Design a protein around this nucleic acid. Structure first.
Ligand SMILES: [K+]
Ligand SMILES: [Mg+2]
Ligand SMILES: [Mg+2]
Ligand SMILES: [Mg+2]
Ligand SMILES: [Mg+2]
Ligand SMILES: [Mg+2]
Ligand SMILES: [Mg+2]
Ligand SMILES: [Mg+2]
Ligand SMILES: [Mg+2]
Ligand SMILES: [Mg+2]
Ligand SMILES: [Mg+2]
Ligand SMILES: [Mg+2]
Ligand SMILES: [Mg+2]
Ligand SMILES: [Mg+2]
Ligand SMILES: [Mg+2]
Ligand SMILES: [Mg+2]
Ligand SMILES: [Mg+2]
Ligand SMILES: [Mg+2]
Ligand SMILES: [Mg+2]
Ligand SMILES: [Mg+2]
Ligand SMILES: [Mg+2]
Ligand SMILES: [Mg+2]
Ligand SMILES: [Mg+2]
Ligand SMILES: [Mg+2]
Ligand SMILES: [Mg+2]
Ligand SMILES: [Mg+2]
Ligand SMILES: [Mg+2]
Ligand SMILES: [Mg+2]
Ligand SMILES: [Mg+2]
Ligand SMILES: [Mg+2]
Ligand SMILES: [Mg+2]
Ligand SMILES: [Mg+2]
Ligand SMILES: [Mg+2]
Ligand SMILES: [Mg+2]
Ligand SMILES: [Mg+2]
Ligand SMILES: [Mg+2]
Ligand SMILES: [Mg+2]
Ligand SMILES: [Mg+2]
Ligand SMILES: [Mg+2]
Ligand SMILES: [Mg+2]
Ligand SMILES: [Mg+2]
Ligand SMILES: [Mg+2]
Ligand SMILES: [Mg+2]
Ligand SMILES: [Mg+2]
Ligand SMILES: [Mg+2]
Ligand SMILES: [Mg+2]
Ligand SMILES: [Mg+2]
Ligand SMILES: [Mg+2]
Ligand SMILES: [Mg+2]
Ligand SMILES: [Mg+2]
Ligand SMILES: [Mg+2]
Ligand SMILES: [Mg+2]
Ligand SMILES: [Mg+2]
Ligand SMILES: [Mg+2]
Ligand SMILES: [Mg+2]
Ligand SMILES: [Mg+2]
Ligand SMILES: [Mg+2]
Ligand SMILES: [Mg+2]
Ligand SMILES: [Mg+2]
Ligand SMILES: [Mg+2]
Ligand SMILES: [Mg+2]
Ligand SMILES: [Mg+2]
Ligand SMILES: [Mg+2]
Ligand SMILES: [Mg+2]
Ligand SMILES: [Mg+2]
Ligand SMILES: [Mg+2]
Ligand SMILES: [Mg+2]
Ligand SMILES: [Mg+2]
Ligand SMILES: [Mg+2]
Ligand SMILES: [Mg+2]
Ligand SMILES: [Mg+2]
Ligand SMILES: [Mg+2]
Ligand SMILES: [Mg+2]
Ligand SMILES: [Mg+2]
Ligand SMILES: [Mg+2]
Ligand SMILES: [Mg+2]
Ligand SMILES: [Mg+2]
Ligand SMILES: [Mg+2]
Ligand SMILES: [Mg+2]
Ligand SMILES: [Mg+2]
Ligand SMILES: [Mg+2]
Ligand SMILES: [Mg+2]
Ligand SMILES: [Mg+2]
Ligand SMILES: [Mg+2]
Ligand SMILES: [Mg+2]
Ligand SMILES: [Mg+2]
Ligand SMILES: [Mg+2]
Ligand SMILES: [Mg+2]
Ligand SMILES: [Mg+2]
Ligand SMILES: [Mg+2]
Ligand SMILES: [Mg+2]
Ligand SMILES: [Mg+2]
Ligand SMILES: [Mg+2]
Ligand SMILES: [Mg+2]
Ligand SMILES: [Mg+2]
Ligand SMILES: [Mg+2]
Ligand SMILES: [Mg+2]
Ligand SMILES: [Mg+2]
Ligand SMILES: [Mg+2]
Ligand SMILES: [Mg+2]
Ligand SMILES: [Mg+2]
Ligand SMILES: [Mg+2]
Ligand SMILES: [Mg+2]
Ligand SMILES: [Mg+2]
Ligand SMILES: [Zn+2]
Ligand SMILES: [Zn+2]
Lengths: 53, 141, 154, 181, 110, 123, 69
RNA sequence: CUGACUGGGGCCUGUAGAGCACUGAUAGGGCUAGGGGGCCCACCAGCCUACCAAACCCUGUCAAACUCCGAAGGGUCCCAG
RNA sequence: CGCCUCCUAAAAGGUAACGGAGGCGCCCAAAGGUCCCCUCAGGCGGGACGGAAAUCCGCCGGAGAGCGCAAGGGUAGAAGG
RNA sequence: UCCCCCGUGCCCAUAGCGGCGUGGAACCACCCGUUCCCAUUCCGAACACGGAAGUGAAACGCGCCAGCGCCGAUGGUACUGGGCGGGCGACCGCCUGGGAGAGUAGGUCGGUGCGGGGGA
RNA sequence: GCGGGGUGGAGCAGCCUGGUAGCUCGUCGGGCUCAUAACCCGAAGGUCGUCGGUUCAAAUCCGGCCCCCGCAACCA
């Protein structure tokens, strides 16, 4: 990890919980990561968004 | 003076000198040869001394084949140093030479010129030698 | 060519025992047979120093046979510079590759030639430092085929 | 398909004469036209601009067939060339689109070559294929010096089923290729 | 030297042959289409069908579907339900697809 | 490319447009138009494709032009250099050929001045 | 062919200044070129436009013999 | 009763030795892209190598970090003592 | 001074010295998943600008290319595009 | 049961390269077309579909040829488990069991399982 | 044993952070001067000590070799 390659949480956009931590390069990938992931609280797949770790 | 123009590695581990020569045990270029009887590391300086010897006897005539080559780097720690701190620096090159190897061959020369020149060359070497003559045994290889 | 040399049979004698008994272990083979033989070392030496792998050696086997062989392999003891074993290739009417000496009217002493055993010649002649010749432009007496690539330098 | 002058000429004039000149036993042994592959080696379009668009648009008009981009295999500093840049437009012409372009190429294009003294007889392949380089694309009737913006030639590979050169030189000459020497 | 054809054939057959199912293998010629359910653990073929044998004719696609039903018919008869469909070097499409749609139609499970 | 292989500039008169062909000066322009009944003053843009082919036909059939003319110029100089003619020695070293002096000038034929150091005065 | 990406080849009449008509197909309905294969001097076998010279230089530097025989 | 060790059987390995097929080294010779060398020429060519220059060929070799090969042994499992 | 690769290491594994050599402290939003298709390096021949090397064509080419970066192993019947 | 072909395995080149010969009834291919399905970073080349006039030219199948490639003994040796000696050493030798690699002789222009189409 | 340096003719930048060789003087050409210096207008000259590697690309990054300055060598 580095200052350009940052750690980040993914937050289920429905129940607002963070369920995954991953990394990205914010120079290559400025936009906030949106990825469908399984949310264990909603117990269903949900579009998760990148929020600050 | 003979040495590999290029090497994948600078230093090699010390050899073992077991066994008769692997190859180059038969005359196959010239008329007479000088064969090693005991194993040794032969230095580039020895080979060169043995070469100029045969030359200045042939008074630049005949031909001289050097059928060993000093590829093995020879390492030596600086004087008066203590053990350790890694391998010494390369200080010269040796050809591993085992009994039965044909080190030199001579041709284009009288039987007396070859016998005599190979004999002088044997004196520049740290081992006992034999002067041999190309046979059909050689020719059958 | 040609030369006559005694040969005997062997089956379970140690090669070391035979060499310690002044004889030279060997084998005698072609497409049709294969026999453990031994020649006498001092006897063989004068035969072979003239009859190299060039000239026919005929093995008077003790059972009356006289098989016509060529010397095909001579494994030498690298230490003592001594024959250690011999291959006697028995000739028969079928063709054979072999080295035939070259005389010149000088890189190569001899040449590999695809011959018939009746067509086995003693000589192949050349003609006239440093200009040199190749195998293509060469004689080839009756019944011999150039058993190299003619691109070889003589 | 559809009938065109060069095509019907190939079967009528060229194929019989070929059997005469060489004696093919099978009817497929006699040479054929495989394809005509056209290559503009642009490079000039490496990064400066996307001139490939007007160069494709004219390669499309000359041939009736849109070309595909060819990107850089490896990177080359001396060519100011990063691996994967678009450096050429290549378009493979086959069947009727091949005869229709060759027909115009022989009839108008090569004549319109300034100081045209004949197609180089030595550009044959050793394999029965022929390639020829052009330096102006306005040699082609679908190209007017008004519509153009920068001189761009091309490579023309006409490929044949002829195993040898002489077979393919006979096929190409009999079809109407003006050879110099 | 392999062609893209035999590379394609190996690349789908190796994948298929790993799953351990009977391989409903489909050969398609310019005229006929062939099929043989194959046990690769024995190197042995269990049921086959083809345009050439059934002597069927007409639309290649319509014919492909028929051998598909014809192969499935004999298949169920010998106790075979599950099956791995080998398209070999062909795209799953058209005739090969038609033969597949019919093998399912006859009850081959794949 | 129209005549000869040159697109002579439109919007200009037809007697100057032809001068832009290598091989046609003002005098040869005057000829062809008279020998073809085209108005030597009408603009190229306003020439019928019969006037075009009438002028074109005469132009590249009367005299040798653009590329071809330069062949006979080059091959002539070539023959001058080939035989060892003094003008060939001149065309070799790229100097004047028509008796001009070279101590000064000749700059057209020799090109930009390759300035060198000079002799030094004493101190 | 792919759709919507190619110019439509249509029956085309290519005209050369030597009144020559050629009937091929093109992206243009009618094209008027100024030279074709039917009238190019290389194509017309041996139309030697201006240069029949050969050479006549420079042994036809004759005219005349006016040095006395 | 499974133990050390031992018998048979299977598998696993890349050392000794050897080899030069790969990576390198490497002697002499043939043939030969880039020239040096150079009677010449640069008008456009050339031309000749008792010299270095890959590649290929032939002869002959070297290697812990090379292997087309490859033991004896070693290990492990099973059965038996 | 921790980690990775190779050698040393004596053909299982492991094996030391201030022994011989290298590299890591990252990266990738695809350089990930799957389905589909494709197969290199290089050699020779041909081809406008165009060259030893851009792009195009033919033939030869089992893998010597490629697989982000060390090395080793592995690999086109793909892990490469 | 035997020959031919088609398909699919197994051995993993004794199966490959090259040269040649041969095959179209059948089967396979090329082929005939591009309406349709589907397809080209362009191309009906490929992929795909509909066909059945032609050709075995290509490919493929089957043969022959040992130039290459590949395989490859026997014999001898190297080395070595174990047991012993020798040499100041470098190193060497003996007994017993094991035993290469290279090279020689020689081999090889495949062998075969299963299903299908045809043939006798 | 440790450290620094090698690049137009001289003395120094550029290296760190890969693509672009820069500054002063000198050298050369031209002016001003009766002439010279100074001064003013222009121009040329460096493949970066060398070899090898990484790289599309090396003055620049990594290794050896040459060369040149500097430091250190204590307890005994
Ligand atoms: K003290
Ligand atoms: Mg990421
Ligand atoms: Mg919970
Ligand atoms: Mg965040
Ligand atoms: Mg040691
Ligand atoms: Mg060794
Ligand atoms: Mg040997
Ligand atoms: Mg010593
Ligand atoms: Mg030492
Ligand atoms: Mg020192
Ligand atoms: Mg040390
Ligand atoms: Mg040391
Ligand atoms: Mg030796
Ligand atoms: Mg001595
Ligand atoms: Mg003696
Ligand atoms: Mg004796
Ligand atoms: Mg002897
Ligand atoms: Mg032999
Ligand atoms: Mg015919
Ligand atoms: Mg069309
Ligand atoms: Mg030619
Ligand atoms: Mg035009
Ligand atoms: Mg062809
Ligand atoms: Mg069908
Ligand atoms: Mg039906
Ligand atoms: Mg299949
Ligand atoms: Mg003019
Ligand atoms: Mg003058
Ligand atoms: Mg007179
Ligand atoms: Mg018990
Ligand atoms: Mg036990
Ligand atoms: Mg051992
Ligand atoms: Mg060894
Ligand atoms: Mg090697
Ligand atoms: Mg070795
Ligand atoms: Mg080893
Ligand atoms: Mg083997
Ligand atoms: Mg061990
Ligand atoms: Mg044990
Ligand atoms: Mg054991
Ligand atoms: Mg065991
Ligand atoms: Mg027990
Ligand atoms: Mg610790
Ligand atoms: Mg650590
Ligand atoms: Mg180990
Ligand atoms: Mg290891
Ligand atoms: Mg363990
Ligand atoms: Mg300890
Ligand atoms: Mg995305
Ligand atoms: Mg990746
Ligand atoms: Mg990947
Ligand atoms: Mg994907
Ligand atoms: Mg080329
Ligand atoms: Mg090129
Ligand atoms: Mg690789
Ligand atoms: Mg790296
Ligand atoms: Mg039956
Ligand atoms: Mg088959
Ligand atoms: Mg036939
Ligand atoms: Mg055939
Ligand atoms: Mg047929
Ligand atoms: Mg027929
Ligand atoms: Mg349509
Ligand atoms: Mg055929
Ligand atoms: Mg057979
Ligand atoms: Mg053979
Ligand atoms: Mg052959
Ligand atoms: Mg083998
Ligand atoms: Mg062998
Ligand atoms: Mg043996
Ligand atoms: Mg021994
Ligand atoms: Mg022993
Ligand atoms: Mg033991
Ligand atoms: Mg022992
Ligand atoms: Mg002792
Ligand atoms: Mg001693
Ligand atoms: Mg011994
Ligand atoms: Mg011993
Ligand atoms: Mg034994
Ligand atoms: Mg023993
Ligand atoms: Mg063996
Ligand atoms: Mg033998
Ligand atoms: Mg043989
Ligand atoms: Mg045979
Ligand atoms: Mg074979
Ligand atoms: Mg089979
Ligand atoms: Mg089986
Ligand atoms: Mg059968
Ligand atoms: Mg039947
Ligand atoms: Mg049957
Ligand atoms: Mg300097
Ligand atoms: Mg300085
Ligand atoms: Mg400064
Ligand atoms: Mg800095
Ligand atoms: Mg920088
Ligand atoms: Mg500067
Ligand atoms: Mg001045
Ligand atoms: Mg005065
Ligand atoms: Mg002054
Ligand atoms: Mg560099
Ligand atoms: Mg730079
Ligand atoms: Mg470099
Ligand atoms: Mg350095
Ligand atoms: Mg103190
Ligand atoms: Zn949620
Ligand atoms: Zn015309």
């Amino acid at each position: 990890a580095s200052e350009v390659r940052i750690k980040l949480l993914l937050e289920c956009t429905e129940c607002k919980r963070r369920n995954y931590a991953t990394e990205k390069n914010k120079r290559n990938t400025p936009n906030k990561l949106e990825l469908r992931k399984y949310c264990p609280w909603c117990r269903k797949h949900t579009v998760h968004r990148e929020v600050k770790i | 003076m003979l040495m590999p123009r290029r090497m994948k590695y600078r230093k090699q581990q010390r050899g073992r000198l077991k066994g008769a020569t692997k190859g180059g045990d038969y005359v196959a270029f010239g008329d007479y040869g000088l064969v090693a009887l005991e194993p040794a590391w032969i230095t580039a300086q020895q080979i060169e001394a043995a070469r100029v010897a045969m030359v200045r006897h042939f008074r630049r005539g005949g031909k001289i084949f050097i059928r060993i080559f000093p590829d093995k780097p020879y390492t030596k720690k600086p004087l008066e140093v203590r053990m350790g701190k890694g391998k010494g620096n390369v200080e010269g090159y040796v050809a591993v030479v085992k009994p039965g190897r044909v080190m030199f061959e001579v041709a284009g020369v009288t039987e007396e010129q070859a016998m005599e020149a190979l004999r002088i060359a044997g004196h520049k070497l740290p081992i006992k030698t034999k002067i041999v003559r190309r046979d059909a045994y050689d020719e059958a290889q | 060519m040609e030369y006559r040399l005694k040969a005997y049979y062997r089956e379970g004698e140690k090669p070391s025992a035979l060499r310690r008994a002044g004889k030279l272990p060997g084998v005698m083979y072609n497409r049709h047979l294969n026999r453990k033989v031994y020649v006498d070392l001092v006897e063989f030496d004068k035969v072979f120093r003239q009859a190299s792998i060039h000239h026919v050696i005929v093995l008077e086997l003790p059972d009356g046979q006289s098989l016509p062989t060529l010397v095909r392999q001579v494994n030498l003891d690298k230490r003592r510079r001594r024959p250690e074993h011999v291959d006697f290739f028995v000739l028969s009417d079928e063709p054979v590759e072999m080295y035939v000496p070259l005389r010149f009217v000088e890189i190569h002493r001899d040449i590999l030639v695809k011959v018939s055993p009746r067509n086995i010649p003693e000589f192949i002649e050349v003609d006239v430092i440093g200009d040199s010749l190749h195998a293509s432009d060469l004689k080839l007496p009756p019944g011999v085929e150039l058993a190299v690539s003619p691109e070889e330098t003589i | 398909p559809l009938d065109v002058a060069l095509k019907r000429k190939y079967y009528e004039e060229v194929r019989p004469e070929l059997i005469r000149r060489f004696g093919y036993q099978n009817v497929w042994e006699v040479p054929r036209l495989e394809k005509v592959v056209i290559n503009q080696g642009l490079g000039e379009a490496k990064e400066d601009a996307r001139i490939l668009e007007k160069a494709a648009q004219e390669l499309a008009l000359i041939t009736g067939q849109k070309p595909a981009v060819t990107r850089a295999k490896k990177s080359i500093s001396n060519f100011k060339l990063r691996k994967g840049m678009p450096i050429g437009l290549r378009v493979t012409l086959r069947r009727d689109r091949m005869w229709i372009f060759l027909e115009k190429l022989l009839n108008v294009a090569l004549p319109r070559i300034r100081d045209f003294r004949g197609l180089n007889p030595n550009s044959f392949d050793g394999r029965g294929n022929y390639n020829l380089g052009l330096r102006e694309q306005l040699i082609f009737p679908e190209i007017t010096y008004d519509m153009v913006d920068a001189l761009r030639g091309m490579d023309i590979a006409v490929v044949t089923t002829a195993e040898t050169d002489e077979e393919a030189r006979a096929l190409l000459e009999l079809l109407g290729f003006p050879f110099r020497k | 030297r392999l062609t893209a054809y035999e590379r394609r054939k190996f690349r789908v057959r190796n994948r298929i042959k790993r799953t351990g199912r009977l391989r409903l293998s489909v050969f398609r010629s310019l005229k006929h289409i062939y099929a043989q359910i194959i046990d690769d653990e024995k190197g042995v073929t269990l049921v086959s069908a083809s345009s050439l044998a059934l002597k069927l004719k007409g639309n290649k696609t319509e014919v492909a579907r028929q051998v598909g039903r014809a192969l499935a018919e004999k298949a169920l008869a010998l106790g075979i339900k599950q099956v791995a469909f080998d398209r070999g070097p062909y795209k799953y499409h058209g005739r090969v697809k038609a033969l597949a749609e019919g093998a399912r139609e006859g009850g081959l499970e794949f | 490319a129209r005549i000869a292989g040159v697109e002579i500039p439109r919007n200009k008169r037809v007697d100057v447009a032809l001068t832009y062909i290598y091989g046609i000066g003002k005098a040869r322009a005057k000829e062809a138009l008279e020998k073809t009944g085209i108005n030597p003053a009408t603009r190229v843009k306003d020439l019928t494709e019969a006037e075009v082919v009438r002028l074109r036909e005469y132009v590249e059939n009367t005299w040798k032009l653009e590329g071809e003319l330069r062949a006979e110029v080059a091959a002539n100089i070539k023959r001058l250099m080939d035989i060892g003619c003094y003008r060939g020695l001149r065309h070799r070293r790229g100097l004047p050929v028509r008796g001009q002096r070279t101590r000064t000038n000749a700059r057209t034929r020799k090109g930009p001045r390759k300035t060198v150091a000079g002799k030094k005065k004493a101190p | 062919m792919k759709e919507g990406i190619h110019p439509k080849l249509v029956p085309a009449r290519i005209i050369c200044g030597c009144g020559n008509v050629i009937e091929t197909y093109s992206t243009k309905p009618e094209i008027y070129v100024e030279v074709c294969s039917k009238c190019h001097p290389f194509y017309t076998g041996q139309q030697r436009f201006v240069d029949t010279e050969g050479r006549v230089e420079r042994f036809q530097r004759r005219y005349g013999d006016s040095y006395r025989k």
